[PDB]
Scaffold this active site. Structure first.
Site, PDB file in Angstrom:
ATOM      1  N   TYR B 172       0.932  -1.142   0.078  1.00  0.00           N
ATOM      2  CA  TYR B 172       0.019   0.057  -0.033  1.00  0.00           C
ATOM      3  C   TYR B 172       0.949   1.238   0.130  1.00  0.00           C
ATOM      4  O   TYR B 172       1.844   1.276   0.502  1.00  0.00           O
ATOM      5  CB  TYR B 172      -0.983  -0.076   1.413  1.00  0.00           C
ATOM      6  CG  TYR B 172      -1.829   1.214   1.158  1.00  0.00           C
ATOM      7  CD1 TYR B 172      -2.886   1.436   0.195  1.00  0.00           C
ATOM      8  CD2 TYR B 172      -1.901   1.906   2.259  1.00  0.00           C
ATOM      9  CE1 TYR B 172      -3.616   2.438   0.423  1.00  0.00           C
ATOM     10  CE2 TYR B 172      -2.748   3.099   2.483  1.00  0.00           C
ATOM     11  CZ  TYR B 172      -3.459   3.235   1.283  1.00  0.00           C
ATOM     12  OH  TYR B 172      -4.538   4.406   1.575  1.00  0.00           O
ATOM     13  N   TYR B 182      -2.956   4.427   9.328  1.00  0.00           N
ATOM     14  CA  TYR B 182      -2.601   3.300   8.799  1.00  0.00           C
ATOM     15  C   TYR B 182      -1.454   3.248   9.846  1.00  0.00           C
ATOM     16  O   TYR B 182      -0.013   3.213   9.459  1.00  0.00           O
ATOM     17  CB  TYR B 182      -1.997   3.542   7.605  1.00  0.00           C
ATOM     18  CG  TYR B 182      -1.844   2.160   6.616  1.00  0.00           C
ATOM     19  CD1 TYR B 182      -2.956   1.165   6.398  1.00  0.00           C
ATOM     20  CD2 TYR B 182      -0.366   1.551   6.554  1.00  0.00           C
ATOM     21  CE1 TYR B 182      -2.817   0.101   5.772  1.00  0.00           C
ATOM     22  CE2 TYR B 182      -0.230   0.476   5.705  1.00  0.00           C
ATOM     23  CZ  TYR B 182      -1.245  -0.364   5.684  1.00  0.00           C
ATOM     24  OH  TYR B 182      -1.176  -1.556   4.784  1.00  0.00           O
TER      25      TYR B 182
HETATM   26  N1  NAI Z   1      -7.838  -3.884   1.467  1.00  0.00           N
HETATM   27  C1  NAI Z   1      -6.669  -2.913   1.423  1.00  0.00           C
HETATM   28  O1  NAI Z   1      -7.189  -1.612   1.477  1.00  0.00           O
HETATM   29  C2  NAI Z   1      -5.468  -2.996   0.976  1.00  0.00           C
HETATM   30  C3  NAI Z   1      -4.910  -4.339   1.043  1.00  0.00           C
HETATM   31  N2  NAI Z   1      -3.518  -4.651   0.404  1.00  0.00           N
HETATM   32  C4  NAI Z   1      -2.645  -5.941   1.089  1.00  0.00           C
HETATM   33  O2  NAI Z   1      -3.512  -6.996   0.638  1.00  0.00           O
HETATM   34  C5  NAI Z   1      -3.385  -8.281   1.493  1.00  0.00           C
HETATM   35  C6  NAI Z   1      -4.500  -8.693   2.254  1.00  0.00           C
HETATM   36  O3  NAI Z   1      -5.667  -7.600   2.112  1.00  0.00           O
HETATM   37  P1  NAI Z   1      -6.956  -7.932   2.182  1.00  0.00           P
HETATM   38  O4  NAI Z   1      -7.564  -8.908   1.041  1.00  0.00           O
HETATM   39  O5  NAI Z   1      -7.558  -6.356   2.603  1.00  0.00           O
HETATM   40  O6  NAI Z   1      -7.189  -8.648   3.486  1.00  0.00           O
HETATM   41  P2  NAI Z   1      -8.198  -9.992   4.079  1.00  0.00           P
HETATM   42  O7  NAI Z   1      -8.883  -9.741   3.217  1.00  0.00           O
HETATM   43  O8  NAI Z   1      -7.992  -9.330   5.356  1.00  0.00           O
HETATM   44  O9  NAI Z   1      -6.614 -10.720   3.934  1.00  0.00           O
HETATM   45  C7  NAI Z   1      -5.479 -11.057   4.822  1.00  0.00           C
HETATM   46  C8  NAI Z   1      -5.397 -12.476   4.970  1.00  0.00           C
HETATM   47  O10 NAI Z   1      -4.332 -12.525   5.848  1.00  0.00           O
HETATM   48  C9  NAI Z   1      -4.670 -13.759   6.878  1.00  0.00           C
HETATM   49  N3  NAI Z   1      -3.512 -13.653   7.826  1.00  0.00           N
HETATM   50  C10 NAI Z   1      -3.440 -12.767   9.036  1.00  0.00           C
HETATM   51  N4  NAI Z   1      -2.246 -13.079   9.449  1.00  0.00           N
HETATM   52  C11 NAI Z   1      -1.924 -14.338   8.954  1.00  0.00           C
HETATM   53  C12 NAI Z   1      -0.711 -15.094   9.732  1.00  0.00           C
HETATM   54  N5  NAI Z   1       0.020 -14.950  10.778  1.00  0.00           N
HETATM   55  N6  NAI Z   1      -0.849 -16.288   8.784  1.00  0.00           N
HETATM   56  C13 NAI Z   1      -1.517 -16.730   7.851  1.00  0.00           C
HETATM   57  N7  NAI Z   1      -2.656 -15.670   7.307  1.00  0.00           N
HETATM   58  C14 NAI Z   1      -2.824 -14.765   8.059  1.00  0.00           C
HETATM   59  C15 NAI Z   1      -6.094 -13.387   7.338  1.00  0.00           C
HETATM   60  O11 NAI Z   1      -6.583 -14.478   8.083  1.00  0.00           O
HETATM   61  C16 NAI Z   1      -6.860 -12.937   6.084  1.00  0.00           C
HETATM   62  O12 NAI Z   1      -7.722 -13.783   5.169  1.00  0.00           O
HETATM   63  C17 NAI Z   1      -2.484  -7.314   2.634  1.00  0.00           C
HETATM   64  O13 NAI Z   1      -0.856  -7.743   2.326  1.00  0.00           O
HETATM   65  C18 NAI Z   1      -2.694  -6.013   2.582  1.00  0.00           C
HETATM   66  O14 NAI Z   1      -2.039  -5.080   3.246  1.00  0.00           O
HETATM   67  C19 NAI Z   1      -2.708  -3.563  -0.012  1.00  0.00           C
HETATM   68  C20 NAI Z   1      -3.288  -2.405   0.174  1.00  0.00           C
HETATM   69  C21 NAI Z   1      -4.554  -1.838   0.509  1.00  0.00           C
END
Ligand code: NAI
Ligand code: NAI
Ligand code: NAI
Ligand code: NAI
Lengths: 287, 287, 287, 287
Positions: B172, B182
């Protein structure tokens, strides 16, 4: 299914323009070439003589689909900009409708509206001289043909383009870091191009929902390049030795990335400078 | 054919990992989900009770292709790293082989070598606090789970990947520019992730001919996003109002870019941070 | 008059902390050294035995102005954080108040509020290994001591600083570009440091009217530098040969820039990464 | 002790040029002003009439030391470049020696060699139009007067400069990020300026051991600016509300930084873009 792309800046089959055309052909995109008048006739001759036949082969039984090939000079916006030295010039006297606006109307008149535009041209009269020794005339010529031409193309072509269309141009890393033999104001022109790509993304995005990006490509010895002091030979040797990926950089590698940026797949990408250089740009100290 | 991708970081269908899965499925890529244990059971229950049937529809009826769903915790590199408490915890007790080393071995033994890896995870205990008030433990916790996990994933998975394989993670913009809200060191974690991506591109490129890039996505309302308390609804509103492309940013928009980056068509791109945010990052002053 | 600066990270006279001290002394700034315990005694012994007399000469005879020399370990935020082993260790046993919180209180109680803070420290247990082979513990160790320490320093010291005070840290370009040899997560630590500098500039700027910037210095042969095994002699040679300014980079070159950044003359500069490397960072291809 | 600075681009006492001159005066630097012919006489009148007397006061009993004030037009490199419309123009007919080369010889002839050069001028005939609607003529005029003028100044002035001399110019962040009302190709000109600063640092550094940097200043309503669509009013309001440092940005704040970059203190800094904008450039999302 009805995709047309105009490629401004093609003089041979060894440049990026061609590589881009080859990849776009795999996706069934109709291609229209914009050819600088001074070399238009020779190009047409080679074409008719089959000199490019092998270069048009794609996949199994598939040949590149060239809709048309038109004389095109990015230094003239409209008919009124054509001076006497040019109108009287031999190479031009025989041609007509080669200014940016004339080509857009001509294209629109024959094939309708398009949805893909590629700006792939550079020209610097004093590219052999270092920046410090480049004259005011040479500098402006470089910016005029290599940078402003992008803005002009957009101004006149958005009229014959469909919403959600995409535009790309090619740039080089010398705009961000110092490259000793990339003179004549070419580095300056690339720096402006990259910045203008951002401003244009804003205007084209808000007003017509059209995207625009630029591809920062790595060395590829070709027509222009070879006129750079030689210089391109070193760039390639260095690239193939210190780049994270030790594979040869092909024109179709830029082509496939261009193809992606021109498709709806890139829907959310705009105003960016995408590096396609085997990662060479990330290095600092060579091992 | 024979394209296998492991997606690490899926807990539901409202995140980027899901949008990435759907898009890869369109290209017939076999999918393997790496699910965090605390939510493994809930996720599976919902899957069995057909609570994801609708979200799995890709193209006229084509349904997503899920090859396997494995418990996966990025905090543990090997079984030796699992602490007594976690091993005995109610949600981990009946699960096995969920460390990074164990999952690589399991996938290898069951399906052979793969060629696509997606790091889609982030975690930070103190994300609700601003950087200045984040404790050492919370900061290191964020870095450990959000950044180091990428490195560890690479170390163990390079042994079970074919040459020319591709790896991507998600970052991000808060890493490059200040985004109040953040916190918890998440911005710090993203900066490290982006820097580690370049360094790893060098090592993975020269030694295994493997590529790695990271996607800087725009705001999406997911579980992780709402953890920040809302901040996310503000980010989304601001984005849809000031970005050069005024359209809703979909998880599948990132998905299609991820597919391109994971395919051989992006062969010459590595160590890069590609922005897929409707162009918002290029803006300075709003309107 | 009344300018007091605390320099955290001095073990001898061959580093940047020393060059920074000499330069600040030229402007009559009272200096307070924060010395790492493992080398506190050796440093002091050398000081008493007059082994630094020569290196303390600034301007015709003007001698450096050292106000105090305190044992300081950036790994500990408060006395509660000190582990049993460290507390009983032979070199820590007879020392007291060396945590970040204790030093802030000591300085405050003895000299009042200060207005200049220099973070000149780095540490990484696995710096000899490349990123890919760095363990989780080594990575987090690097981040904890090299990056988080900056944040912690800020948290405790903002209470004993006047408005319009200035803070600076030192970073290296390996955070933005790949430098093989700079391992153990040091590159990761620098990237986080540079990102945290921006975020802290926001918080410290709005809430306390305090500035923070970081200097990206060129190669200098110091203790930390040689810890990497040499890599440093290569970096230095390469720098003196390819930088636009071919001159030896002195610790005092960074010192004078640090003095400017710490003085009220840089009032409108904050959250920045200033390069003081004879211009090397702007180069792409050598000669 | 023998420091002379030429400031190209001064028409009033409310711009950056003046702020820079004021700060340089505190260091006892002799100042030479380069004044655009069209406003040279009016400027001279105000001067003689004491209209600038209060603006020349510095510290206690110290007044700004202006060595000379010469007519200067950055759009003419040599006498030969002077066309008829200009040679015949009323405002110019009365003046002589206002081309870049003539001024360098004139300065050298009267005061000897100098060691400080400031490029502080911008001019874009179509700055009111957005980039998309800027003509080719307007674009090139902007690049010619605002960017090339930097290169030309260096080419002709290195001859009358001492080794280890320093040069600086002023730029704006619109070159890197999108600023809606900064049109006419001014953003393009700033992008080229910043890139050319890098290339020039290499050539001037290796060949004459001379440094060159550019200062990316924040908004300051003045002569030019006020001709920007108004526009400057918003920029300032936004800057004072969302910048990490909520203090008013003064011309002398740029001045003091300029002073530092022109002194031997900056010995190791070259080819850089230094931000003096109260840190506004580091923000992404406004709170
Ligand atoms: N949603 C947003 O606004 C943004 C998302 N992305 C990035 O995308 C990725 C996922 O984001 P989202 O799809 O929003 O989140 P989710 O849709 O919250 O996906 C994150 C996943 O990480 C898993 N997780 C957390 N800790 C863990 C661990 N120790 N071991 C294994 N799994 C673990 C969760 O259970 C979850 O399914 C992150 O790296 C985030 O920073 C990047 C910029 C913005
Ligand atoms: N040469 C290289 O290795 C690199 C190429 N790319 C960029 O790709 C573009 C093309 O490069 P190449 O394929 O190497 O060159 P070519 O392969 O030399 O392509 C340039 C084209 O520009 C056309 N052209 C020149 N002046 C023109 C004018 N006034 N009007 C219309 N067309 C004109 C030429 O006739 C030619 O077809 C340039 O913008 C270049 O900077 C980017 C980085 C490096
Ligand atoms: N020497 C170089 O090539 C470069 C140096 N700088 C940076 O300058 C800073 C100091 O570098 P140098 O002067 O070269 O090193 P020194 O000259 O090695 O300075 C580092 C100091 O850190 C102290 N230290 C280590 N761990 C500590 C802890 N836990 N608590 C308190 N003090 C601790 C050491 O005892 C030492 O005096 C570092 O942040 C380094 O990364 C930046 C770029 C290059
Ligand atoms: N206006 C602002 O707030 C900003 C100013 N700076 C930069 O500082 C410089 C000066 O800006 P200001 O002090 O605001 O403007 P002024 O205060 O308008 O300074 C510009 C000077 O350029 C001179 N000039 C114009 N055309 C010329 C020509 N052909 N030959 C010789 N001199 C010529 C004018 O007569 C004037 O003295 C510009 O390069 C500008 O981009 C940077 C960012 C923002």
């Amino acid at each position: 299914n009805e995709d047309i792309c105009f490629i401004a800046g093609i003089g041979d089959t060894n440049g990026y323009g061609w590589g881009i055309a080859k990849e776009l052909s795999k996706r069934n995109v109709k291609i229209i070439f914009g050819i600088w008048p001074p070399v238009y006739n020779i190009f047409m001759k080679n074409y008719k003589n089959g000199k490019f036949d092998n270069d048009m082969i794609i996949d199994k039984d598939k040949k590149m689909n060239i809709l048309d090939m038109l004389p095109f000079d990015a230094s003239f916006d409209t008919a009124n900009d054509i001076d006497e030295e040019t109108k009287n010039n031999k190479r031009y006297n025989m041609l007509q409708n080669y200014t940016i606006e004339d080509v857009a109307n001509l294209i629109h008149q024959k094939y309708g509206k398009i949805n893909m535009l590629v700006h792939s041209l550079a020209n610097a009269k004093e590219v052999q001289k270092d920046l410090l020794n480049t004259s005011r005339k040479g500098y402006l010529d470089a910016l005029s043909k290599s940078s402003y031409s992008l803005i002009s193309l957009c101004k006149y072509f958005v009229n014959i383009m469909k919403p959600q269309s995409s535009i790309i141009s090619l740039t080089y890393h010398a705009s961000q870091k110092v490259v000793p033999g990339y003179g004549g104001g070419m580095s300056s022109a690339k720096a402006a191009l990259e910045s203008d790509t951002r401003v244009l993304a804003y205007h084209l995005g808000r007003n017509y929902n059209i995207r625009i990006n630029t591809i920062s490509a790595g060395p590829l010895k070709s027509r222009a390049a070879t006129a750079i002091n030689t210089f391109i030979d070193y760039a390639i040797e260095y690239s193939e030795k210190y780049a994270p990926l030790r594979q040869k950089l092909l024109s179709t590698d830029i082509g496939s990335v261009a193809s992606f940026l021109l498709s709806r797949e890139s829907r959310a990408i705009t105003g960016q400078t995408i590096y396609v250089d085997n990662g060479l740009n990330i290095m600092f100290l060579p091992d």
